[PDB]
Amino acid sequence: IDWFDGKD
Amino acid sequence: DLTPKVQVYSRFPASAGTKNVLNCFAAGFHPPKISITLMKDGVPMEGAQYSDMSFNDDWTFQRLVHADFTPSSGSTYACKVEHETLKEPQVYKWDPE
């Protein structure tokens, strides 16, 4: 599954 | 060198009067924005699929365009590519073989 990125 | 590396090839070895798919694969380029048109005698064909796109581990983009078709006798097929790393559109002729 795809997953969420963190904020740069 | 971040110009598109292009190949034109058919799904099946081409045959007289036989249904097939024309492919154009562009790779090794950046930016991702690219213009890839499949062409029959200097004119676009009908029903072109574009995927994916994707990129390699080296981050360079790749794109595949394919369209159902039957090679017509006397016709020239080619893939017209436009990308900002090139001065002028590039034309990659298909060899029916």
Add this chain to the structure above:
Amino acid sequence: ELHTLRYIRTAMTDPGPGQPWFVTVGYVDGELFVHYNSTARRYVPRTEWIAANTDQQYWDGQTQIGQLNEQINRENLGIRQRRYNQTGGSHTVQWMFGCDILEDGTIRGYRQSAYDGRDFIALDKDMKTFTAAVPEAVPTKRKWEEESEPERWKNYLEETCVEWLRRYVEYGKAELGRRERPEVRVWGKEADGILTLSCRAHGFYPRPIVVSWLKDGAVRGQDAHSGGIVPNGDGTYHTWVTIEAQPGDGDKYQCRVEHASLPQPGLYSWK
């Protein structure tokens, strides 16, 4: 096994014309199985097996993961451009992550990112820290490590990614384990006085293959030229190897194709 799961993310300021600015595609064992983009606003199956072995939960969740990533990536594009003092132009964020399961029970993971096609930042091998590839990524390293991002990506890569990869390989076992035979054609048009011989394998699967030119029965490698492995539109592959000969020596050359689908290696002359 080996088996692999890979997600690749592209976020761009300049797609452009009728093209989605944000895309994410997933691959199992190197084959496309999942697709999301900012135009569709929806994750969709790209293989029959994934569709047949998931419920609506899977698509609605992934869809919203996709939509969430879209907003995060919109901001990240903004942030990286500002780090680079950009106020316009074509720019892109790239993410590439996933896991391998090796035949031996051992797994692997990797989480890496690029900006304008160049390394920006990545989780390092031990998954305890991030290493900025450029000074512009340094504040990102600092922030994430303060936020325990590494730990969060250690869990995804080593547990979530792997566990789902096990489910996927089991779903599409038949499809991923199939064999498709290439049709081969040899051909030599010329001019400018050089006979260019070409040998093409059409529609082979799996990916690995050997296509070589033989001259007097001896493999003429140093000077054959390959287009490498390029994909067809149906989950099969294509390769194309050429060699220049004397116009007349044509009859001395042979293309040989080795592939798992073949009863025996193909051996073919020109004409």
